[PDB]
Amino acid sequence: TCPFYKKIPGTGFTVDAFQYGVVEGCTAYFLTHFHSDHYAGLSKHFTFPVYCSEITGNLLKNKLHVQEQYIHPLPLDTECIVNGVKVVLLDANHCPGAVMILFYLPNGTVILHTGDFRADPSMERSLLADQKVHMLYLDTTYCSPEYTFPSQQEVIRFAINTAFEAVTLNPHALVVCGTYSIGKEKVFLAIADVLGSKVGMSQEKYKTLQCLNIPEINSLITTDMCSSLVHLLPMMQINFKGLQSHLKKCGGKYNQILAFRPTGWTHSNKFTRIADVIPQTKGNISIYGIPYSEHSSYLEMKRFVQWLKPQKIIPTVNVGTWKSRSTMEKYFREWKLEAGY
Ligand code: NI
């Protein structure tokens, strides 16, 4: 049954609740972003109103074949009325088209649902600055102090520098980047830009990227693998057997692979700096795991929450175990005592 942390009290609304059938009392289903754990259940047979960003709506129409008449895209940073209730969508700094949702309840309560987000000080100058928020539905994916990772900019500099050095040493090296969902497009786009190449990929992945409103995209990506020296493959194929196999397919054009796996966190993070990251190598194949995250680190999360000063926090991630829940509630209390709210 639909969990309470997916329902918005005082409304007919749910958030990211498409796998429970017809939710009793729901007049409008919101979708924060196009990741499978959140859209699970949507298809061309869905006949209730879905509210989302323009980009999410492009993906629902083209990838899932949801019919147009049920897709209700909203502009960002704009006050809109849905079924009698004021709402605003804000950029969540997650994957393309990902939003946070502000609900202004008829009784005066203000609720922020973060969806999935990577908290940033730029959010402290959005429409959140303009009123008090009482209840926070929080993406707690990395809510423990061990979770440190570098800025996205530090990680992309590492990747660009590594790829440019390798391919300038060996012009017959191929760069491969793993993917299994939208998000993290900067990794492969920044590497292709430094090398003067388009990114090559499957027809299914090309179609997905063509839904994302990325500027100048026709100039950056392609389905002609033979003309490209950056290839995208499924994440599952980023291992020595998979990569050896792909190298065979390229008809002797290449004699080395340098591959990237953009993991979120890996416990190499508690000891090692980005400057110090090294690959796993076998023969003429090297694999780098790079800590590119689209979720808040512990410290980014804590700064956002201590700024916002909500009256009540409802976690949306790691809620299935008592140990996790109790850990998270302890940190919430520390933060509140340290800041004084
Ligand atoms: Ni997500």
Q: Rounded to whole angstroms, how far apart are CA atoms 42 and 253?
A: 42
Q: Rounded to whole angstroms, how far apart are CA atoms 212 and 186?
A: 13
Nearest to 305 by CA among 136, 89, 99: 136
Other C-beta atoms lying within 10 Å of the C-beta of residue 315:
19
Between the CA of 98 and the centroid of ligand 1 the distance, in Å, is 8
Distance of CA 108 to CAs 94, 133, 291, Å?
A: 29, 10, 41
For the chain, helix, strand, coil in percent to 5 are 35, 20, 45
DSSP per-residue codes, 251-320? TTS-SEEEEEEEES--GGGGT--GGG---EEETTEEEEEEE--SS--HHHHHHHHHHH--SEEEE-SS-S
Question: What's the reported resolution, in angstroms, to a tenth?
Answer: 1.5
Other C-beta atoms lying within 10 Å of the C-beta of residue 27:
15
Between the CA of 30 and the centroid of ligand 1 the distance, in Å, is 14
Between the CA of 137 and the centroid of ligand 1 the distance, in Å, is 15
Between the CA of 182 and the centroid of ligand 1 the distance, in Å, is 9
Between the CA of 43 and the centroid of ligand 1 the distance, in Å, is 19
Q: What angle do CA 229, 235, 238 make, to 5 degrees?
A: 65
Residue 8 near residue 111, CB atoms below 8 Å? yes
**Counting every residue, how long is the chain?**
341
β 28-30/13-15 pair status = parallel
Domains by residue range for the chain, with CATH? 1-147+296-341 (3.60.15.10), 148-295 (3.40.50.12650)
Between the CA of 33 and the centroid of ligand 1 the distance, in Å, is 7
